[PDB]
Symmetry: C2
Subunit: 185 residues, 2 copies
């Protein structure tokens, strides 16, 4: 059957740690799991470029989208087809937050592009690890737009987003995530 | 105000040669010219990623679009703003023909992606060098070749369809003939 779960938030919100703890939880339960991430899960070279290059928001988004399109087709959908729980550390909501709310691109266009890039694939649950930019493990105005952008996305889809306080101890966050996930297993 | 011109067609149709000769002709008319190309005129690294093995048509198109977005923004629009004739060896019609007609991606999606990527910028004229597909698998090239001709049928004022098998000098003179009413 397969279950698709994502993690989202600012860099340093503990997403990689929590994706690893979630994967381990599922391993403990005997449930096959695939852990993956964006950018780079589709086209690793995109990650390397976005690291080095200054690009227009449109070009940045379109590169992210290409990576995502490959990621969905070659990694995520085949994992789900095998009945795995697939966890992605970042997915489309990251582009919406950073390129949309952060860099100002219009959301309906972002979503139209994404419609064919993702083959319409949506996470069943998305865990947003919310904190102020100053708490992540001026220049801050961008990151505040992104943080508020994520909160905006979450309030628009309360049936998909679970918003957690990312400044809580690591173990407590993991237990909150497990609690939210248990009904879906 | 500038003038935006493109060349299109199958690879080996002589597009690069015609782009070059066109730039020369225009400079001889005292017109400043910017000669550019896709892929690579926006993000030269897109050429490596484009060769990625078994790349999905969607990913391929999105890669071309990223380069195209940077190309329009950083090269072509600033060129036009400076009053240059900008000639691009390939532009959006390349994606529509190859990724749309060839690889089967839906045209309306290709266009909606392109709307922001290109900021609606369209060439005044596009010279389509129509080449037999066996000269460019063959089934793919036949779709692409025919796809281009469909595009040209659909926008008959913008497209100038030329026989790629004619001598270079004849093609160049035909391009020159279509351009004279846009020059003083």
């Amino acid at each position: 059957p397969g279950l698709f779960l994502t993690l989202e938030g600012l860099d340093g919100s503990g997403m990689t740690t929590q994706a690893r703890r979630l994967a381990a939880f599922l391993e403990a339960q005997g449930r096959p799991v695939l852990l993956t991430r964006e950018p780079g899960g589709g086209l690793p070279e995109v990650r390397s470029l976005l690291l080095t290059q200054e690009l227009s928001p449109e070009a940045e988004y379109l590169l992210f989208s290409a990576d995502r399109a490959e990621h969905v087709r070659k990694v995520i959908l085949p994992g789900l087809a095998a009945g795995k729980v697939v966890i992605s550390d970042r997915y489309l909501d990251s582009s919406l937050a950073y390129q949309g709310y952060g860099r100002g691109l219009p959301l309906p266009w972002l979503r139209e592009v994404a419609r064919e890039a993702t083959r319409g694939l949506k996470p069943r649950l998305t865990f947003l690890l919310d904190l102020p930019p100053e708490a992540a493990l001026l220049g801050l105005e961008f990151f505040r737009r992104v943080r508020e952008g994520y909160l905006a996305l979450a309030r628009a889809e309360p049936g998909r987003f679970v918003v957690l306080d990312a400044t809580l101890p690591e173990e407590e966050i993991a237990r909150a995530i497990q609690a939210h996930l248990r009904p879906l297993l």
